[PDB]
Amino acid sequence: FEDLPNFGHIQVKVFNHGEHIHH
Known part of the structure; x- marks a missing residue:
């Protein structure tokens, strides 16, 4: 994040990742 x-x-x-394919 730079602009x-x-x-x-x-x-x-x-x-x-934390929605669908959460391990």
């Missing part, structure tokens, strides 16, 4: 939240786009994958 463009590329780290915030990386956390979208973390939300999808």
